[PDB]
Design an enzyme around this catalytic site. Structure first.
Site, PDB file in Angstrom:
ATOM      1  N   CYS A 103      -4.005   9.431  -7.122  1.00  0.00           N
ATOM      2  CA  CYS A 103      -4.155   8.069  -6.618  1.00  0.00           C
ATOM      3  C   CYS A 103      -3.013   7.200  -7.107  1.00  0.00           C
ATOM      4  CB  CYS A 103      -5.481   7.460  -7.051  1.00  0.00           C
ATOM      5  SG  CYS A 103      -5.510   5.844  -6.316  1.00  0.00           S
ATOM      6  N   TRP A 139      -8.085   0.255  -0.379  1.00  0.00           N
ATOM      7  CA  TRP A 139      -7.486  -0.259   0.841  1.00  0.00           C
ATOM      8  C   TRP A 139      -6.318   0.638   1.225  1.00  0.00           C
ATOM      9  CZ3 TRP A 139      -7.687  -3.858  -3.354  1.00  0.00           C
ATOM     10  CH2 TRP A 139      -6.507  -3.923  -4.117  1.00  0.00           C
ATOM     11  N   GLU A 151       0.230   5.892   4.950  1.00  0.00           N
ATOM     12  CA  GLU A 151      -0.928   6.733   5.239  1.00  0.00           C
ATOM     13  C   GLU A 151      -1.186   6.786   6.735  1.00  0.00           C
ATOM     14  OE1 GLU A 151      -4.439   6.650   2.567  1.00  0.00           O
ATOM     15  OE2 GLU A 151      -3.585   4.744   1.887  1.00  0.00           O
ATOM     16  N   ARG A 160      -3.879   3.317  -8.647  1.00  0.00           N
ATOM     17  CA  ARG A 160      -4.601   3.290  -9.917  1.00  0.00           C
ATOM     18  C   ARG A 160      -4.451   2.052 -10.784  1.00  0.00           C
ATOM     19  NH1 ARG A 160      -3.505   8.485 -13.086  1.00  0.00           N
ATOM     20  NH2 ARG A 160      -2.047   9.029 -11.397  1.00  0.00           N
TER      21      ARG A 160
HETATM   22  C1  HEM Z   1      -6.927  -0.140  -4.478  1.00  0.00           C
HETATM   23  C2  HEM Z   1      -6.722   0.622  -3.381  1.00  0.00           C
HETATM   24  C3  HEM Z   1      -6.267   1.934  -3.479  1.00  0.00           C
HETATM   25  C4  HEM Z   1      -5.093   2.372  -3.005  1.00  0.00           C
HETATM   26  C5  HEM Z   1      -3.980   1.502  -2.456  1.00  0.00           C
HETATM   27  C6  HEM Z   1      -5.079   3.793  -3.210  1.00  0.00           C
HETATM   28  C7  HEM Z   1      -4.154   4.614  -2.644  1.00  0.00           C
HETATM   29  C8  HEM Z   1      -4.251   5.985  -2.631  1.00  0.00           C
HETATM   30  C9  HEM Z   1      -3.418   6.814  -1.801  1.00  0.00           C
HETATM   31  C10 HEM Z   1      -2.295   6.363  -0.892  1.00  0.00           C
HETATM   32  C11 HEM Z   1      -3.896   8.050  -1.913  1.00  0.00           C
HETATM   33  C12 HEM Z   1      -3.401   9.242  -1.124  1.00  0.00           C
HETATM   34  C13 HEM Z   1      -4.372   9.594  -0.005  1.00  0.00           C
HETATM   35  C14 HEM Z   1      -3.965  10.836   0.770  1.00  0.00           C
HETATM   36  O1  HEM Z   1      -2.742  11.099   0.878  1.00  0.00           O
HETATM   37  O2  HEM Z   1      -4.874  11.543   1.267  1.00  0.00           O
HETATM   38  C15 HEM Z   1      -5.017   7.991  -2.816  1.00  0.00           C
HETATM   39  C16 HEM Z   1      -5.700   9.077  -3.246  1.00  0.00           C
HETATM   40  C17 HEM Z   1      -6.756   9.052  -4.103  1.00  0.00           C
HETATM   41  N1  HEM Z   1      -7.282   7.899  -4.625  1.00  0.00           N
HETATM   42 FE1  HEM Z   1      -6.654   6.067  -4.456  1.00  0.00          FE
HETATM   43  N2  HEM Z   1      -6.213   4.235  -3.866  1.00  0.00           N
HETATM   44  C18 HEM Z   1      -6.959   3.099  -4.002  1.00  0.00           C
HETATM   45  C19 HEM Z   1      -8.255   3.100  -4.414  1.00  0.00           C
HETATM   46  C20 HEM Z   1      -8.941   4.194  -4.844  1.00  0.00           C
HETATM   47  C21 HEM Z   1     -10.303   4.136  -5.356  1.00  0.00           C
HETATM   48  C22 HEM Z   1     -11.200   2.900  -5.359  1.00  0.00           C
HETATM   49  C23 HEM Z   1     -10.577   5.375  -5.849  1.00  0.00           C
HETATM   50  C24 HEM Z   1     -11.675   5.862  -6.553  1.00  0.00           C
HETATM   51  C25 HEM Z   1     -12.632   5.185  -7.244  1.00  0.00           C
HETATM   52  C26 HEM Z   1      -9.400   6.164  -5.576  1.00  0.00           C
HETATM   53  C27 HEM Z   1      -9.351   7.512  -5.802  1.00  0.00           C
HETATM   54  C28 HEM Z   1      -8.374   8.334  -5.335  1.00  0.00           C
HETATM   55  C29 HEM Z   1      -8.500   9.766  -5.316  1.00  0.00           C
HETATM   56  C30 HEM Z   1      -9.572  10.612  -5.987  1.00  0.00           C
HETATM   57  C31 HEM Z   1      -7.512  10.221  -4.533  1.00  0.00           C
HETATM   58  C32 HEM Z   1      -7.369  11.646  -4.040  1.00  0.00           C
HETATM   59  C33 HEM Z   1      -7.957  11.661  -2.631  1.00  0.00           C
HETATM   60  C34 HEM Z   1      -7.680  12.950  -1.894  1.00  0.00           C
HETATM   61  O3  HEM Z   1      -7.656  14.009  -2.552  1.00  0.00           O
HETATM   62  O4  HEM Z   1      -7.481  12.902  -0.660  1.00  0.00           O
HETATM   63  N3  HEM Z   1      -8.399   5.441  -4.974  1.00  0.00           N
HETATM   64  N4  HEM Z   1      -5.251   6.719  -3.246  1.00  0.00           N
END
Ligand code: HEM
Ligand code: HEM
Ligand SMILES: C[C@H](O)[C@H](O)[C@H]1CNc2nc(N)[nH]c(=O)c2N1
Ligand SMILES: C[C@H](O)[C@H](O)[C@H]1CNc2nc(N)[nH]c(=O)c2N1
Lengths: 420, 420
Positions: free
Chosen positions: B118, B290, B295, B121
């Site tokens: 993520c 968000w 993406e 973070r």
């Molecule tokens: C504040 C907004 C957030 C942004 C801008 C953000 C952005 C991102 C991005 C761009 C990815 C890559 C997604 C992909 O390529 O499939 C990602 C993956 C991830 N994010 Fe965040 N994130 C945010 C919030 C969160 C939240 C609220 C959580 C968890 C409580 C989180 C957990 C993760 C996890 C576990 C992944 C891996 C997802 C996967 O394996 O497809 N993210 N995030």
């Protein structure tokens, strides 16, 4: 054992078996993958002060010879056995051994084919090999190199080639070029603290200065050649500028681009690397290929730690250089890269855009899995610095592993060499 | 032990120590780094048929409690000891244990902070937690989810939140959402062999059809919610369209863009993942944040395996869609991504460009090294699909490792679930 890898873009799946022939020497593990390291210790092959122990050199030597003869269509059972004998004899009677003419040629091409970070590996069979193991003085090295450059430059039609210097003996009589690249620009730290030229080459230029070279304090000053023969102290040799082919940067649409007054050398040549062949080590083995747009456009020109011109062209294009969400940085990089390609094309100099490069690689990769059911690949280095997802390699799952022959990184000579 | 990592762009170096607290469970090793795998077995947390053995659950349980109390400024020696007692008792007397209200909140935020993939973070502390461990029926799950969506959508000002469902007991009474994302478009395989909609969601939509949902055969059809309660067979629930906020795609300069008639949902929410907290497992825990420009722009729209519109816009822009070296593909992707950002901005919907995202991450990363001298990071996933080298993260060396709490991938429910 078979390891399954998929190309999510095409859905095409491969079954890797070649990973077994790979030696288990990695900086990463089953508790923390050291994937993302610029120069892992595993990819490095440091210096030595004692010759390679005959007992441990033998297994590797035999191993290679088998690989070499295994390459031929029709087995040369006769010569094969003969070679194996000759080598064994030589190793225990002299402590080491010499490679045949064709053996060296094979080794170089194979090591290239085995380099997981080279995206231009589809060209692995096309390589000119210069045998300079006969060389003995710094001056001779210089002359061999000039021959290399003259050849590779080829008046614009870049050709791949490599010059192999005497193999490492005891590790004290190393023949090696200290320069990261044969041709590279100078980097000077100005009095006001600012930096003129290539920032990445500051430390090295400083060295050249300490060795007597007088700084020309210009943005595109080609550094001298720092040559080390027989482990002796290095000597400087300025490369005849006639041999240094450059390309002036100009954009097809934007005439103001010429005003930036940019240019770059046509020949990308890695000199500071070591070649490992069946136990043998060659600290001096410069090799070259041709440039890929992004290398210059994206890295050389846009990296903050490099020439960093992004800011400038953004203003010149009249973009919202303050609102990041405007993606001005992106339009800028694209335009800069078009300029690079265009300039090379217009000046009849061999260049290759990252898209064509990537497609060529996919082809090569597929071939590798037919030939040897494997293809070592460092995803992090293979995906272009721009438009990653737009290139097929981005979607290709890949395995990274060290084989032999191989091109290892070395510790910068000045950091270990003992002065006389 | 300290492991040194450098950011070649800024030269700033970090000393990682947090890698020790990391459990040594990885698909890669000291002989072949399995770095580049979409979904390694190490990141997966499969199903079970027997409750987690009390003896092995205890060490982890204690471990967590310590971490939890270790977070507080002034130590609560009293409550700490009290909790440790209560937990131990509970584990051996019931075979498992329940988390306190605040403990759960902490765990979710921590697991996010511990997610190496993520990039957003920096927002780890801002998270809304919905306790739905009290839930017992599929319908209830649906209602809890609608509350989640209503909240997160927030009329355009997206807010991060997570809904935690009942923890796994014996592994047969799993509460989980089968959908990869709460909101996602349908993918249909047409009679002529072509594909309409989101190609990546074809298999899943097929499932929905098999379960009774009738296909609307449109490019942007929101699939129903496939909810599984207590391990029972799943039930479909159509999400009230009022709760599905979408954004129509249009380019600021190119009016013909509207003609492509593109759009996308505003809420990115991962549902199919599992949360691990001190030995406990939660197969049902949807969370959202968000969107980040790329993406949608790069991945969703340009991936060949996705909507793949690159070809089309290239023609529309009147570019040399045949000469790769023209970099038409690149100009096109840039323009498409500008359209995405612009459309969100114009419709007052929270969106974040990859540049701002990357910068925010660097900040977060630095903070992590002060707070806990470490920050797990999967370089491959953190660097944006476009203009990689133009983002600071590209130049940052990073270590990838699994901690706890953590968000593990699960095996797609339909592939293991036993029908009634
Ligand atoms: C504040 C907004 C957030 C942004 C801008 C953000 C952005 C991102 C991005 C761009 C990815 C890559 C997604 C992909 O390529 O499939 C990602 C993956 C991830 N994010 Fe965040 N994130 C945010 C919030 C969160 C939240 C609220 C959580 C968890 C409580 C989180 C957990 C993760 C996890 C576990 C992944 C891996 C997802 C996967 O394996 O497809 N993210 N995030
Ligand atoms: C045919 C032209 C070639 C092309 C288009 C090509 C392209 C590339 C590119 C783009 C890189 C990345 C460079 C960087 O990011 O620093 C690379 C790396 C590499 N290539 Fe090739 N290559 C070619 C020829 C060669 C040749 C002839 C050899 C060796 C015999 C070779 C050996 C390698 C090695 C060892 C690396 C790693 C260099 C490093 O660590 O900086 N390449 N190549
Ligand atoms: C930290 C990271 O490894 C580093 O920035 C790498 C990424 N990928 C790269 N890829 C290539 N081809 N060349 C490089 O110099 C780099 N730098
Ligand atoms: C094969 C390779 O791992 C795969 O294409 C990865 C690369 N990096 C990624 N990075 C992010 N954020 N998301 C992805 O889906 C991917 N796909």
């Amino acid at each position: 054992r078979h390891v399954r890898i998929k190309n999510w873009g095409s859905g095409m799946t491969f079954q890797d078996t070649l990973h077994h022939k790979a030696k288990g020497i990695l900086t990463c593990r089953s508790k923390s993958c050291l994937g993302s390291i610029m120069t892992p210790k595993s990819l490095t092959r440091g210096p030595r002060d004692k010759p390679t122990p005959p007992d441990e050199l033998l297994p590797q030597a035999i191993e290679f010879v088998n690989q070499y003869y295994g390459s031929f269509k029709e087995a040369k059972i006769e010569e094969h056995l003969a070679r194996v004998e000759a080598v064994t004899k030589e190793i225990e009677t002299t402590g080491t051994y010499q490679l045949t003419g064709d053996e060296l040629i094979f080794a170089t091409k194979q090591a290239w084919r085995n380099a997981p970070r080279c995206i231009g590996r589809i060209q692995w069979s096309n390589l000119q090999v210069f045998d300079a193991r006969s060389c003995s003085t710094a001056r001779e090295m210089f002359e061999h190199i000039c021959r290399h450059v003259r050849y590779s430059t080829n008046n614009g039609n870049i050709r791949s080639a490599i010059t192999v210097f005497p193999q490492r003996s005891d590790g004290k009589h190393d023949f090696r070029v200290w320069n990261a690249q044969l041709i590279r620009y100078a980097g000077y730290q100005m009095p006001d603290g600012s930096i003129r030229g290539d920032p990445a080459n500051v430390e090295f230029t400083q060295l050249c200065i300490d060795l007597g070279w007088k700084p020309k304090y210009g943005r595109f000053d080609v550094v001298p050649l720092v040559l080390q023969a027989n482990g002796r102290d290095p000597e400087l040799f300025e490369i005849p500028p006639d041999l240094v082919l450059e390309v002036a940067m100009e954009h097809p649409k934007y005439e103001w681009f010429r005003e930036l007054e940019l240019k770059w050398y046509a020949l990308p040549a890695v000199a500071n690397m070591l070649l490992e062949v069946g136990g043998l080590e060659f600290p001096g083995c410069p090799f070259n290929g041709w440039y890929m747009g992004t290398e210059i456009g994206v890295r050389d020109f846009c990296d903050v730690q490099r020439y960093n011109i992004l800011e400038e062209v953004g203003r010149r294009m009249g973009l919202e250089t303050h609102k990041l969400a405007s993606l001005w940085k992106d339009q800028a990089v694209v335009e800069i890269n078009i300029a690079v390609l265009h300039s090379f094309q217009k000046q009849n100099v061999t260049i290759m855009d990252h898209h064509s490069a990537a497609e060529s690689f996919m082809k090569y990769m597929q071939n590798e899995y037919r030939s040897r059911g494997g293809c070592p690949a460092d995803w992090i280095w293979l995906v272009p610095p721009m438009s990653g997802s737009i290139t097929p390699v981005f979607h290709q799952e890949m395995l990274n592993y060290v084989l032999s022959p191989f091109y290892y990184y070395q510790v910068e000579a000045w950091k270990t060499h003992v002065w006389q």
